[PDB]
């Protein structure tokens, strides 16, 4: 949550509110990003890999976390499809389905990333899937900081 408070500081920098931004609107965005947000977001994305490495060194390898997560809450894939599951609870049960890749929207098809798929369907596979979505979100953040064009911020 130290890093999460850094991202709400970034939200306050771009929109003026820490949490409820009112920023993304029909027809683009309301305001252009201020100058110097690139260096701040880049420094945060450089340090966040090491922060996740420390958090995974504490949480992921531990026997108590494994005994509290693994083989617990196992959901089958046909139950996931029949009960209308979506997202990580689909992806943790082995089903290869990510809406950012199959039906792309808002320039997800010009950026490249990986879709994490679980195997067993328990809590541990979904936790590892969430950490892998975190790291692939860092990759997409890297690509979007690498390329952006100069132009308008909203439709005309």
């Amino acid at each position: 949550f130290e890093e999460r408070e850094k991202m709400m500081e970034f939200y306050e920098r771009v929109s003026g509110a820490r949490m409820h931004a009112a920023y993304i609107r029909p027809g683009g965005v309301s305001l252009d990003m201020p100058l110097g947000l690139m260096d701040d977001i880049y420094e945060f994305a450089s340090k966040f890999a090491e922060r996740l490495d420390e958090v995974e060194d504490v949480l992921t390898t531990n026997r108590i976390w494994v005994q509290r997560t693994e083989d617990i809450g196992i959901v089958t894939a046909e139950e996931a499809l029949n009960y209308g599951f979506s997202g990580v609870m689909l992806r943790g049960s082995g089903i290869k389905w990510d809406l950012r890749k199959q039906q792309p929207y808002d320039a997800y098809n010009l950026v490249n990333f990986d879709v994490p798929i679980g195997t067993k369907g328990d809590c541990y596979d979904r936790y590892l899937c969430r950490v892998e979505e975190m790291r692939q979100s860092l990759r997409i953040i890297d690509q979007c900081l690498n390329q952006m064009p100069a132009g308008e911020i909203k439709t005309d």
Binding site: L35, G36, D40, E43, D53, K96, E152, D156
Partner: protein, 91 residues
Amino acid sequence: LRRDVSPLIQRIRAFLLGREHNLALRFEDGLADRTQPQPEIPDGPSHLLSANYYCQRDGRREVLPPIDLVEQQKQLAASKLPTPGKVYAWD
């Protein structure tokens, strides 16, 4: 330059972390300036004053009521089976 512990405690922390340590805390040298020069937002594709008319740019009027497909086939008509889309293997 930056506030930290003495390098003996830094080496102790780097040994106990299992990796080389980069400072999580932000500093004034690593961030951008709070006062920036005043920017100029560039114009988009249709702020040209000569060529554009709204009738060629009106997306709200180019929509239509939904098409009755049986009626459309009846008007326009007077192998593999139809699929809703491309086959994706999620297995």
